Write a protein that binds this ligand. Structure first.
Ligand SMILES: O=C(O)c1ccc2cc[nH]c2c1
Lengths: 6, 99, 99
């Protein structure tokens, strides 16, 4: 897996 | 604390007498939770991630405790697969990266 | 270094003999970089985040420098909007969160 935010 | 990164950096948070947990996320501009308990009126916001863009519910002036540290700021409610504390709140508790 | 979080924590990296820049992301389990060739054989992997999933190529045991600090580990390559250093490599350089 999990990669997180713009 | 001084938190290593061998596992996900999940911490206790408290909002409105609900205890939750959320990941301290330096790669997130914003704080995003899957739900909050009866939080009221909101405005729409779009955010992006690796997979595309999502519509979220923006709540301002939320009082939150993160690992016992009090902060105030914007919390988004949206379809994040893990609750995340982003830089908008990490800055408020004095969080840094160090190596 | 000590990195405050008032802006995105982008740093210089060196991979494949090339200088690039990447976001230090404590909310990323794994490292994902934009399309490049790397040595060795890859295997297909899926990763998720906000907005859904993406297909990546997984390369194992890759040398990377992160602000001059050497690490060796898994690097995923695919259509990410930003290069991301995740926990798999942050741990190798002794990066911690501090507040
Ligand atoms: O790079 C590729 O050709 C490729 C194709 C399919 C998948 C599925 C997960 N990763 C992939 C990479």
């Amino acid at each position: 897996x999990v990669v997180x935010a713009x | 604390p001084q938190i290593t990164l061998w596992k996900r950096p999940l911490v206790t948070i408290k909002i409105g007498g609900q205890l939750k947990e959320a990941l301290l996320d330096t790669g997130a501009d914003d704080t995003v939770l899957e739900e909050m308990n009866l939080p009221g009126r909101w405005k729409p916001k779009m955010i992006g991630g690796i997979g595309g863009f999502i519509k979220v519910r923006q709540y301002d002036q939320i009082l939150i405790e993160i690992c016992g540290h009090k902060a105030i700021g914007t919390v988004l409610v949206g379809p994040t697969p893990v609750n995340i504390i982003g830089r908008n709140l990490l800055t408020q508790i004095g969080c840094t990266l160090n190596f």
